[PDB]
Amino acid sequence: GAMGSMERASLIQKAKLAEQAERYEDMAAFMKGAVEKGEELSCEERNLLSVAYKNVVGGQRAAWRVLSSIEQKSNEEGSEEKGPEVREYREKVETELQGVCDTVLGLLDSHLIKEAGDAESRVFYLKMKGDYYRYLAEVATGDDKKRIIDSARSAYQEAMDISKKEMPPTNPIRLGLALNFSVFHYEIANSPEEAISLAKTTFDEAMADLHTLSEDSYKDSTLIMQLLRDNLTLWT
């Protein structure tokens, strides 16, 4: 690893600098280096890891969508033949995206998940596993696709089971997990009714627990609840 010679603490410091500079590929590489030191990650460090890779894969996903739309239009009747270039370049972006997803999944498997015993860490990592399989599913074609979809589902379901047993219904990790699993149902699994049910139940159970919270915790939870509401408005 190119980061093998750098101190763990220096990697974390530089990840924070890279975030401030909006250098997310650098941020991700620093955080990968930190994970590969072999120690467990703190809450803050888990968030740095997530932010870094979310921003990298988010740019790739957006690019893929642009290119896929151009490719689909090329395949309409009356569209002039333009050669292999759109497909080739879509495939290039796709392969790079898959590579980033495989890198994240690899970190989770070696060895973040197996060392994570506390509910906050275990749920966090299992949610990430679901998310990165979901991104793989977005570009998958076939029943290859089926096994990827099932991997996402399984990770999300294990995270949900732990979160319901171990965390309050307002916990931001639990809420963001439920939000993302509802998106999985709607966008990936062709299960809009399951998506809507999950978002509704999650919102309502969180609303009933807000009275327990401090001002600052209330703000954190209500931010995510608003996203559940925004999806329900789009979907109904």
């Binding site: 993302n180 998106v183 709607y186 966008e187 995510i224 925004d230 999806n231």
Partner: peptide
């Protein structure tokens, strides 16, 4: 369909 918001 794809416009649904995931966690930030």
């Amino acid at each position: 369909d794809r416009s649904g918001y995931s966690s930030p």
